[PDB]
Amino acid sequence: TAAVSTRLEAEALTASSGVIKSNADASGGQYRIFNAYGVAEQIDYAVPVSHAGAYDLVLGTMRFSDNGTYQLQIDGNDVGAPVDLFRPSGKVVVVDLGSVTLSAGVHEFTFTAVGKNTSSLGYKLPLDYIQLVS
Numbered sequence: 001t002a003a004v005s006t007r008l009e010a011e012a013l014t015a016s017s018g019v020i021k022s023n024a025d026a027s028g029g030q031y032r033i034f035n036a037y038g039v040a041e042q043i044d045y046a047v048p049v050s051h052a053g054a055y056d057l058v059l060g061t062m063r064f065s066d067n068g069t070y071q072l073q074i075d076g077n078d079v080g081a082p083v084d085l086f087r088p089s090g091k092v093v094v095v096d097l098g099s100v101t102l103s104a105g106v107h108e109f110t111f112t113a114v115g116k117n118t119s120s121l122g123y124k125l126p127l128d129y130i131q132l133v134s
């Protein structure tokens with residue numbers, strides 16, 4: 001048994017809050033929107049890792065005009081610079097969060113709103129999926 005790449009749908013994962021919504025352009029046809037209205041609000045996801053090792057981290061979100069800017073932490077550790085999820089067009093936003101080493105077990109992926117693009121109308125996180133690339 002070696003590490004396999006996996007896609008974990010935000011609407012299927014256990015999360016601390018967030019509303020499940022349908023969208024024909026979302027992975028799985030659904031997403032989970034965290035309706036943050038300002039900074040320091042956070043949503044937690046429980047993310048299983050069956051095999052210890054190194055992974056590249058990819059986030060898929062919806063492209064909405066009120067997407068915020070988020071700091072990912074894993075198990076309380078900052079991962080990556082804050083990721084600004086505002087784009088001017090498109091159906092989805094896909095972002096590369098770099099590499100980590102993850103132990104075997106279930107990890108806490110915390111998304112904290114830390115700001116928003118000046119063009120954005122809000123602070124929200126319409127997360128579609130988390131993809132762990134071995």
Ligand SMILES: [Ca+2]
Nearest residue numbers: 027028030128
């Ligand atoms: Ca999805």
